[PDB]
Design a protein around this ligand. Sequence first.
Ligand SMILES: [Cl-]
Ligand SMILES: [Cl-]
Ligand SMILES: [Cl-]
Length: 293
Amino acid sequence: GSFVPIEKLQVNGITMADVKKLRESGLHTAEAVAYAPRKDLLEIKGISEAKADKLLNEAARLVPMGFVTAADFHMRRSELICLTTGSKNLDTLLGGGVETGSITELFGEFRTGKSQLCHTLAVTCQIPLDIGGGEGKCLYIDTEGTFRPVRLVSIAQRFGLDPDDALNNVAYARAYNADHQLRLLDAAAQMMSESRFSLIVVDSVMALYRGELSARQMHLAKFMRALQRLADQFGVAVVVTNQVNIMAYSSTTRLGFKKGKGCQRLCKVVDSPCLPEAECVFAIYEDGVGDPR
Ligand SMILES: [Cl-]
Ligand SMILES: [Cl-]
Ligand SMILES: [Cl-]
């Protein structure tokens, strides 16, 4: 578990009925309750101002909300799960792999390995922590109708998983428009509180554009917040592709992809608040992302 069950707040007066309203308002985790703005709670038909306090205080008991030393914070970060990309080179570039808790943006032109990396991740997020996995399910939001379950079979076997189980562990959803894409997230909160997910994939967030450009950006920004909110509330890793700034601001780790020779691909760290601006070379294989021969 990478988040505190909201049911743990049903004490000292908090009822199942109270939590029921919280869930209904979209809070399915203690962290969610802990990170919710007081105003949001108060505007919930049924929650008293004195009750909101009860909730906040209780949640704050289960979820850290105070100060700690930068030294301590460093330690905690070093404990974050980093999902393996399947490539030693790439994992090294990312200081271990895809960092859970924030958004990693995969950008570049079509056929640069972005989608392939997502297919691999959809599987490695399911494997044992001991081997760079997240022992959790994957929420896969596809806006281009390019996801292909069959590609995951070969990948699962490569990691010793039973293909049937691997495909069963991926909650797939095709989004047809921005409002739909955003609507899918609300349902994801519910699912994630019912089964352990370790990763959310959105290929690609830029579909958000298909005079009113300002409206597009405002929608894109709202979607990215929702994604980061889910990362905070459930402690999962989030990867988003971007076919080719709201993205530079929202994304934590931004990786640029270019096509290399043959099945080889290049990946450069474009933005990161802690990773050095370096680049590596990885490859694409019938059984997922790996390192060059
Ligand atoms: Cl750090
Ligand atoms: Cl490719
Ligand atoms: Cl790609």
